[PDB]
């Protein structure tokens, strides 16, 4: 449970008496604890928003250099200037006029033509890929709150061999999933992928190991050279003048110089955008949203035919309060009497032991039959003073507690 009960964004959704549907909102880095009447407590959390098979739409260049700068000029009324490289699309040229005359190698004064080209090479580029609901896939983790060892589970590693933890996946074309939770029944998951986000107005952008989600219109209006899609060898760049400028032209020459790298200029424009991961051809997200419906009628308690744990418990840690007011208590059970139902409650009247508040780990059950087993619990106490009562009989455990 630990990663769920230590998270800051933890919503508490409650079921019904015998209800079968509850609504949940699943955001990244957050957990939803779903409690129900006479049902085990299950944790829901969205762990992986990932996109794949994105269509490359347009690639912009943000750093470049030139080569093979050649020029050609002709006298006034001697016709337009021409270079062999003027037709090459890998070269960028610029027509211009410059004063010529008798001391400049011509027979009549006036302005004559002049063209200067340069081979266009792009140091680094960025790519904008398109995203469609045919690319989304959400991964939700379904864990059981209180299986006597979830108090030592902190992450997803090892969830395959753990029957109390199930992993499901959701796509917009397949928004449903079902999985078994071991001896705690099974869980249903009907999710709305439309309420996730608006992924028809955005592009997935990659630039030098950094990746964002950017608006479609902001991406079109970027003033940089660009091609459509991608191509092997050398593709055709459009609007090469965004990085190449032509400076003051002498009577037979023109200085070609490139602008500085525009990487930092793009970073400053991507301050408010969402940052994303890159895993090969797949894209990974850490900022999303998910409204889902939980089918909990198939959830069940682990064995209720068990007997109450008759041996004596001992505190292993000192009870600590969580960020949500709940108390975590870790206990050690010295009994060897098989699996047994853990007697745990909160009683404001120590003589009648009438329950106040509730347990977050509903119906805790020691499943080990060896001495000195450990189990961590969680309790939602009432405000003010109340007694944590764990166990039965003489050696029962009492720890005073106050909640604001």
């Amino acid at each position, epitope marked *: 449970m630990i990663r769920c009960i230590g998270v800051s964004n933890r919503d508490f959704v409650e079921g019904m008496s015998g209800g079968t549907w509850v609504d949940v909102v699943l955001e990244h880095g957050g957990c939803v604890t779903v409690m129900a009447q006479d049902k085990p407590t299950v944790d829901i959390e969205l*762990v*992986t928003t*990932t996109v794949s098979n994105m269509a490359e739409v347009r690639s912009y260049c943000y750093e470049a250099s030139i080569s093979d700068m050649a020029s050609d000029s002709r006298c006034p009324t001697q016709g337009e200037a021409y270079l062999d490289k003027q037709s090459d699309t890998q070269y960028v040229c610029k027509r211009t006029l410059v004063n010529r005359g008798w001391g400049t190698g011509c027979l009549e004064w006036g302005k004559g033509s002049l063209v200067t080209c340069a081979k266009f090479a792009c140091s680094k580029k960025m790519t904008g890929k398109s995203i469609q609901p045919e690319n989304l896939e959400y*991964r939700i983790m379904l864990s059981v709150h209180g299986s006597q060892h979830s108090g030592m589970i902190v*992450n*997803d*590693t*090892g*969830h*395959e*061999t753990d029957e109390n933890r199930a*992993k499901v996946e959701i796509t917009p074309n397949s928004p449903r999933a079902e999985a078994t939770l071991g001896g705690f029944g099974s869980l249903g998951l009907d999710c709305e992928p439309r309420t996730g986000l608006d992924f028809s107005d955005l592009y997935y952008l990659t630039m030098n190991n950094k990746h964002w989600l950017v608006h479609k219109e902001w991406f079109h209006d970027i003033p940089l050279p660009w091609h459509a899609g991608a191509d*092997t*060898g050398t593709p055709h760049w459009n609007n090469k003048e965004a990085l190449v400028e032509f400076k003051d032209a002498h009577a037979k020459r023109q200085t070609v110089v490139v602008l500085g790298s525009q990487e930092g200029a793009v970073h400053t424009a991507l301050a408010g955008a969402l940052e994303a*991961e*890159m*895993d*090969g*051809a*797949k894209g*990974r997200l850490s900022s999303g949203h998910l409204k889902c419906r939980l089918k909990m009628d198939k959830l069940r308690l682990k064995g209720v035919s068990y007997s109450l744990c008759t041996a004596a418990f001992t505190f292993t840690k000192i009870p600590a309060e969580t960020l949500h007011g709940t108390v975590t208590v870790e206990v050690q059970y010295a009994g060897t009497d098989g699996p047994c139902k853990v007697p745990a409650q909160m009683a404001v009247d120590m003589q009648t032991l009438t329950p106040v508040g509730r347990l977050i780990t509903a119906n805790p059950v020691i499943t080990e039959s060896t001495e000195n087993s450990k189990m961590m619990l969680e309790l939602d106490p009432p405000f003010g003073d109340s007694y944590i009562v764990i166990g039965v009989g003489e050696k029962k455990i009492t720890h005073h507690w106050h909640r604001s």
Partner: antibody
Amino acid sequence: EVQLVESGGGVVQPGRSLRLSCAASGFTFSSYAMHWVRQAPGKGLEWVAVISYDGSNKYYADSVKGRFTISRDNSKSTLYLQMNNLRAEDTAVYYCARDHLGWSSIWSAPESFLDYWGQGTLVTVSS
Amino acid sequence: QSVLTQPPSVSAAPGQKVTISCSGSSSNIGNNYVSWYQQLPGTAPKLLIYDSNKRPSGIPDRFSGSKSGTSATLGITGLQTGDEADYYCGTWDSSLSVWVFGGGTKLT
């Protein structure tokens, strides 16, 4: 246009070493994790090694643990596999394979699958 | 005999539905993504099915990938004489921390 060219494999004696190479082109090599898969003549496929995009994570098959070593130079877009202390059973046609992911997450290894394969390089151990 | 086991040899008449299946454990096929590969005789392996239900662009709809329980099955509806090859399944094993292949299945 994607292509992988394996090279560096001939006939070698047991106990000695060998270094293979896989030339990558047509994709950002530094962005994708890469694998080695060998196949003995007339046998099944056997996965050998994997290296992530930044070369930080490496996993080997139990048969070659500690004896092989996968490595990569993202600058020149090449893949190296250092096989030393060989045996007669290591004779196989070795393929390098591109993985759809760069292995930059906990969920990369499960989602992993080998995207593009090379052509092979017949390594033979005779004695 | 191997981390994943598929039949060594299956044969179907041309123009008929044939299926091939490999089974593993809860650590390889149960949770992780199963992929298939077609190795035509004397050729390099060829990615056939990824994400356990999806066809790469170019593979005809004669092929189909499924996954139920801890065992994924390959599908070939309307076999043709150009499909005779060896077929391998494989995925990542989480308990072994080692990528594993299937035994292979020469189709006839």
